[PDB]
Design a protein around this ligand. Structure first.
Ligand SMILES: O=C(O)c1ccccc1CN1C(=O)Cc2ccccc21
Ligand SMILES: O=C(O)c1ccccc1CN1C(=O)Cc2ccccc21
Ligand SMILES: [Cl-]
Lengths: 149, 149
């Protein structure tokens, strides 16, 4: 459970925003890419897994689930690849809500940056530091530290 | 001390590898860029600070120390920008050693990837997971979780 992440893909300004959410904490990492390909998704997971102890990834769609490049990256990084089928139906609406929230934050910072990618990273910052009184950033560290001990 | 990071820039295949090291743990994040500019460095710090609680950054050289774009990014992200002058002389040789080690790991994986950026991320993975018996990845989480409590 401290090792579970969910992939999520959303669109803005004719570009793709790839998101990984740490399910237990709500902590996210994100990147802007021209389009969702197996190679981009594989590279993103490789980055994620070098930064956080990723055990399981729920993929965002069947193309990334099937992608041989994605499967190779998960093998390389010791990640168990799974489907992201909302067996809990709450799950899809939660993602939708996260995408709406992220896009809201992007809109609030959009004018402070020329390039979308910069605005996305600012939104990641704001999302992860937001107090809700712990932040997502604090929760993920606490969850994983507890798990290490 | 749990909030202190050090910037480091090194070169390979005619490209630049930008590294941030969490001083207390030895944990790293890295990226490949065409060349070290204020804008690239600023973006890299924005990414870092949205992912980890960055309080202080020792910059890697005087150009990044002076850069108005870097200073703006540190202001935005609540980061105290400092010089990286090795007042402890131990410090410069430690960086050198890290660069040598990273390049060694890059060489060991280089043939498994077409693009240098992929090899760099694989090396970050290997570096952060290496048992030394805790890993850098485990140490950074422990250090910061302890600090939160
Ligand atoms: O405008 C951009 O997209 C961009 C790209 C790379 C670095 C900085 C920026 C924009 N920017 C500044 O110039 C100052 C600044 C502070 C904080 C965030 C972004 C920026
Ligand atoms: O060759 C590359 O640079 C590159 C770029 C993006 C994604 C995957 C790769 C290479 N690669 C695969 O195709 C399989 C694989 C597993 C693990 C890491 C990289 C790769
Ligand atoms: Cl797409």
């Amino acid at each position: 459970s401290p090792g579970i992440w969910q992939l999520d893909c959303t669109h803005l300004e004719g570009k793709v925003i790839l998101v990984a959410v740490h399910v237990a904490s709500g902590y996210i990492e994100a990147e802007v890419i021209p389009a969702e390909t197996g190679q981009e998704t594989a590279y993103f997971l490789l980055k994620l897994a070098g930064r956080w102890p990723v055990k399981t990834v729920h993929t965002d769609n069947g193309s990334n689930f099937t992608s041989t490049t994605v499967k190779a990256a998960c093998w390389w990084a010791g990640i168990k690849q799974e489907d992201g089928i909302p067996y809990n139906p709450q799950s899809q609406g939660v993602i939708e809500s996260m995408n709406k929230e992220l896009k809201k934050i992007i809109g609030q910072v959009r004018d402070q940056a020329e390039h979308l990618k910069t605005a996305v990273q600012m939104a990641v910052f704001i999302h992860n530091h937001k107090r809700k009184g712990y932040s997502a950033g604090e929760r993920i560290v606490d969850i994983i530290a507890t798990d290490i001990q």
